Enzyme design. Structure first.
Site, PDB file in Angstrom:
ATOM      1  N   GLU A   8       0.801  -1.135  -0.130  1.00  0.00           N
ATOM      2  CA  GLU A   8      -0.035  -0.055  -0.075  1.00  0.00           C
ATOM      3  C   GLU A   8       1.037   1.108  -0.116  1.00  0.00           C
ATOM      4  O   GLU A   8       1.351   1.410  -0.970  1.00  0.00           O
ATOM      5  CB  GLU A   8      -0.755  -0.202   1.117  1.00  0.00           C
ATOM      6  CG  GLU A   8      -2.112   1.077   1.177  1.00  0.00           C
ATOM      7  CD  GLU A   8      -3.032   0.957   2.539  1.00  0.00           C
ATOM      8  OE1 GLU A   8      -3.175  -0.038   2.851  1.00  0.00           O
ATOM      9  OE2 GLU A   8      -3.543   2.096   2.937  1.00  0.00           O
TER      10      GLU A   8
ATOM     11  N   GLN B 282      11.310  -8.216  15.667  1.00  0.00           N
ATOM     12  CA  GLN B 282      11.126  -9.614  16.371  1.00  0.00           C
ATOM     13  C   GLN B 282       9.601 -10.265  15.958  1.00  0.00           C
ATOM     14  O   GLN B 282       9.065  -9.766  15.018  1.00  0.00           O
ATOM     15  CB  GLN B 282      11.365  -9.244  17.870  1.00  0.00           C
ATOM     16  CG  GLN B 282      12.778  -8.835  18.164  1.00  0.00           C
ATOM     17  CD  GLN B 282      12.970  -8.608  19.565  1.00  0.00           C
ATOM     18  OE1 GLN B 282      12.322  -8.710  20.550  1.00  0.00           O
ATOM     19  NE2 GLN B 282      14.045  -7.707  19.992  1.00  0.00           N
TER      20      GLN B 282
ATOM     21  N   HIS C 180       3.630  -1.998   7.964  1.00  0.00           N
ATOM     22  CA  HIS C 180       2.783  -1.972   7.214  1.00  0.00           C
ATOM     23  C   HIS C 180       2.413  -0.063   6.861  1.00  0.00           C
ATOM     24  O   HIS C 180       2.917   0.491   7.794  1.00  0.00           O
ATOM     25  CB  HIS C 180       1.387  -2.581   7.240  1.00  0.00           C
ATOM     26  CG  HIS C 180       0.502  -2.489   5.922  1.00  0.00           C
ATOM     27  ND1 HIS C 180      -0.497  -1.772   5.826  1.00  0.00           N
ATOM     28  CD2 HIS C 180       0.878  -2.944   4.843  1.00  0.00           C
ATOM     29  CE1 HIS C 180      -1.027  -2.010   4.613  1.00  0.00           C
ATOM     30  NE2 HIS C 180      -0.174  -2.758   3.837  1.00  0.00           N
TER      31      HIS C 180
ATOM     32  N   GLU D 294      -1.752   4.510   2.172  1.00  0.00           N
ATOM     33  CA  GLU D 294      -1.237   4.620   0.943  1.00  0.00           C
ATOM     34  C   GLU D 294      -0.305   5.656   0.537  1.00  0.00           C
ATOM     35  O   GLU D 294      -0.655   7.001   1.027  1.00  0.00           O
ATOM     36  CB  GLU D 294      -2.700   4.802   0.101  1.00  0.00           C
ATOM     37  CG  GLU D 294      -2.454   4.225  -1.389  1.00  0.00           C
ATOM     38  CD  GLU D 294      -3.686   4.512  -2.102  1.00  0.00           C
ATOM     39  OE1 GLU D 294      -4.838   4.249  -1.700  1.00  0.00           O
ATOM     40  OE2 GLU D 294      -3.598   5.127  -3.325  1.00  0.00           O
TER      41      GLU D 294
ATOM     42  N   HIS E  31       9.224  -7.848  20.302  1.00  0.00           N
ATOM     43  CA  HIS E  31       8.065  -8.757  20.034  1.00  0.00           C
ATOM     44  C   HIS E  31       6.673  -8.043  19.966  1.00  0.00           C
ATOM     45  O   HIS E  31       6.364  -7.432  21.114  1.00  0.00           O
ATOM     46  CB  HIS E  31       7.933  -9.902  21.133  1.00  0.00           C
ATOM     47  CG  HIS E  31       9.405 -10.539  21.374  1.00  0.00           C
ATOM     48  ND1 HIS E  31      10.035 -11.365  20.523  1.00  0.00           N
ATOM     49  CD2 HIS E  31      10.245 -10.321  22.476  1.00  0.00           C
ATOM     50  CE1 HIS E  31      11.178 -11.820  21.136  1.00  0.00           C
ATOM     51  NE2 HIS E  31      11.404 -10.970  22.194  1.00  0.00           N
TER      52      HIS E  31
ATOM     53  N   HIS F  87       3.354   1.415  12.101  1.00  0.00           N
ATOM     54  CA  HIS F  87       2.587   1.666  10.712  1.00  0.00           C
ATOM     55  C   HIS F  87       3.100   3.104  10.226  1.00  0.00           C
ATOM     56  O   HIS F  87       2.863   4.093  10.765  1.00  0.00           O
ATOM     57  CB  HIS F  87       1.311   1.629  11.411  1.00  0.00           C
ATOM     58  CG  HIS F  87       0.317   1.637  10.200  1.00  0.00           C
ATOM     59  ND1 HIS F  87      -0.168   2.511   9.104  1.00  0.00           N
ATOM     60  CD2 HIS F  87      -0.294   0.306   9.906  1.00  0.00           C
ATOM     61  CE1 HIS F  87      -0.735   1.875   8.384  1.00  0.00           C
ATOM     62  NE2 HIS F  87      -0.977   0.627   8.407  1.00  0.00           N
TER      63      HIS F  87
ATOM     64  N   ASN G  65      21.004  -9.729  18.585  1.00  0.00           N
ATOM     65  CA  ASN G  65      20.205  -9.909  17.273  1.00  0.00           C
ATOM     66  C   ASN G  65      21.222 -10.102  16.225  1.00  0.00           C
ATOM     67  O   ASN G  65      21.071 -10.542  15.248  1.00  0.00           O
ATOM     68  CB  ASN G  65      19.125  -8.867  17.172  1.00  0.00           C
ATOM     69  CG  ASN G  65      17.813  -9.425  17.904  1.00  0.00           C
ATOM     70  OD1 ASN G  65      17.000 -10.038  17.335  1.00  0.00           O
ATOM     71  ND2 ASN G  65      17.832  -8.980  19.167  1.00  0.00           N
TER      72      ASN G  65
HETATM   73 ZN   LIG Z   1      -1.896  -0.829   7.364  1.00  0.00          ZN
HETATM   74 ZN   LIG Z   2      13.021 -11.011  23.568  1.00  0.00          ZN
END
Ligand SMILES: [Zn+2]
Ligand SMILES: [Zn+2]
Ligand SMILES: [Zn+2]
Lengths: 209, 209, 209
Positions: free
Chosen positions: C58, C71, C77, C80, C113, C118, C198
């Protein structure tokens, strides 16, 4: 086209000289779209739902007791439990009666959808951890109820208490003041019903695999 | 190496004598990394994103109307709807104009990323359920907006209202007092845009499968 | 029996005439149960955990800098970024030093996590985005800390600040008043340790594939 195993060993790292594979009771059901990695113990009759992720690759070990359930999108992970000297970081290790764990989930415990327990943490028997709730650096006693969206961070929740929905408990003073679960409390029978259901789901689902 | 189907029947259990497979409109798009299980109905032009989990194995049925979307990591699940006597538990059954459901998601509804609707629950047409929001034991009316991280537990949200971000609504008194969506409200056009986008994503994604 | 790729192109849509495939550094590790779709850039030494979903279909593009981590169950996301005239929607586009993004995740950033960023959104270098936290329509500065369950919606979080656990920041006035990270703050060293871990997990996991 994405070929792989959802139950597997943790990788070799500076704090993990030798990899471990999960130890899962034959009667537990691990959904094919769940992920179980590393130094994990899963007890009997446990149901692990789609999208859950149990990853014992940093802090270890991660234990889930008998007849407990790890619902959809639940994450179990922990802070490093061994240093650079292969030195156990005692602050990130939980002790549950003579045995050491990064994350300890007791027997008959329900980790409801989208909740998360991050070590160091211990959740005592017959406790319901509500939808979208969070436990981190805490010890939740037995027969507790974390309502949906509640959280316990850096505290000890005494046995038999509950945390109202949305409440974030960050101090021992506030954890000391939580309400008690009574016969008439709205979530008083929730865990027993959930445990009953999920033990039966595990068996049903094992008969489909 | 993890071989399986992401759309499947629910297991045989004491409350589910005969398994059901999902009933999904040819025009809906179910991501390969989504999970859809059991007594589910998915309507036309619906987009189901990666990591969503729609599981109708306890409370059933779970219905998602036309042109609605179930975004990444959204979970749909419900409390048992039939007892031990094959006795319908009316408290856990929602009624949406003559038809009974564990979870009812109407038409043109957006279940945004990481939200969750747990039955008994009904979400009316053209409502936006915000990112990380939660609906449980509630009826959300049509043309509503749950802002990100809001929640409705045990209540009825009248038509045309919204719940400010982070607000947990647990009483009918508070649900009665929610603000109204107006032309100038910041999320007033959010759902229509999202629905437009997701109908087009479903079609685009169907052309890749 | 569910055959598919977890790293793939976005679909053709009215706002996406030509599909893009993710551009992922050879040294990044993308878990097989993570999903990475569309116009995405993933930098070196990045770890992407099980159940994460990075979807640039999008708003686009979505960038994750070097040595950052996404995580378990984290979702990325965006709204638009191009209209119907192939018209860039500047309100949904973030600008990070001469380059335009729907979502920009800097270097050495930890998306813990079940968090979610967004777009339009930018997260500056060396920032820890806590477990279950949320960023939407905001610019989080560098060296920040979003504690678990905090949120920043529609604001700018100045460099070096933190958001207490559970706090939802929706106004620039409140973002202006956040506390400063100091040497003695409880999460002051959290990000550096997480990044270290990580980067090493990515390498360990790359040696298993
Ligand atoms: Zn979205
Ligand atoms: Zn952790
Ligand atoms: Zn449930």
């Amino acid at each position: 086209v994405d070929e792989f195993s959802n139950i597997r060993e943790n990788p070799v790292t500076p704090w993990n000289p030798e990899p471990s594979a999960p130890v899962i009771d034959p009667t537990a059901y691990i959904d094919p779209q769940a992920s179980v990695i590393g130094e994990v113990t899963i007890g009997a009759n446990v149901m692990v739902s789609p999208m859950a992720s149990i990853r014992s690759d940093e802090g270890m070990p991660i234990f889930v007791g008998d007849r407990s359930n790890v619902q959809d999108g639940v994450v179990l992970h922990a802070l490093e439990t061994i240093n650079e000297e292969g030195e156990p970081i005692e602050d990130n290790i939980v002790e549950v009666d003579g045995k050491e764990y990064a994350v300890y989930i007791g027997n008959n415990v329900s980790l409801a959808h989208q909740s998360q327990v991050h070590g160091p943490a211990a959740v005592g028997d017959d406790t319901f951890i509500g939808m979208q709730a969070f436990v981190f650096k805490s010890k939740v006693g037995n027969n507790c109820v974390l309502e949906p969206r509640s959280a316990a961070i850096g505290v000890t929740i005494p046995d038999g208490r509950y945390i109202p929905a949305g409440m974030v408990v960050t101090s021992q003073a506030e954890a000391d003041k939580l309400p008690e679960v009574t016969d008439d409390y709205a979530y008083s029978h929730t865990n027993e019903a959930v445990v009953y259901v999920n033990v039966h789901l595990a068996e049903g689902y094992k008969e489909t695999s």
